From Swiss-Prot:
Domain free text: The PH domain specifically binds phosphatidylserine, which is enriched in recycling endosome membranes, it doesn't recognize PIPs.
Function description: Involved in retrograde transport of recycling endosomes.
Protein's recorded name: Pleckstrin homology domain-containing family B member 2
Signal peptide stretch: none
Binding site for a 1,2-diacyl-sn-glycero-3-phospho-L-serine: 22
PH domain location: 4-111
Organism: Homo sapiens (Human)
Intracellular or extracellular location(s): Recycling endosome membrane
Taxonomy, superkingdom: Eukaryota
Length: 112
């Protein structure tokens, strides 16, 4: 199996009960899975999404629906993974460039 990731890093994610923006650590696997954890120790797995099978769209910026950025931050930092079962994963990068780097990586993961 794989011993190394396509991309890893922090993103803020809007939570599924409280809808709070909270830090999570993300690993994108070469099998297509995006895994997110509470922190960068990889101890507390939260959830996953299989980009090829589950994702039907990736939105960024003003495209993102039903989600507003953390206070003070441009919505151009945001990206939203849209899944076929209606799950949306609303994300906020540190910068607009971090957002684009993830967008392009996640788009490619769908077709990889």
């Amino acid at each position: 199996g794989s011993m190394a990731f396509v991309k890893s890093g922090w993103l803020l994610r809007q939570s599924t009960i409280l809808k709070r923006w909270k830090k999570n650590w993300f690993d994108l696997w070469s099998d297509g899975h995006l895994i997110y954890y509470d922190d960068q120790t990889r101890q507390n797995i939260e959830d996953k999404v299989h980009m090829p099978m589950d994702c039907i769209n990736i939105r960024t910026g003003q495209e993102c629906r039903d989600t507003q950025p953390p206070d003070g931050k441009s919505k151009d930092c945001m990206l939203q993974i849209v899944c076929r079962d209606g799950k949306t994963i609303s994300l906020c990068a540190e910068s607009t460039d971090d957002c684009l780097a993830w967008k392009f990586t996640l788009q490619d993961s769908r077709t990889n």
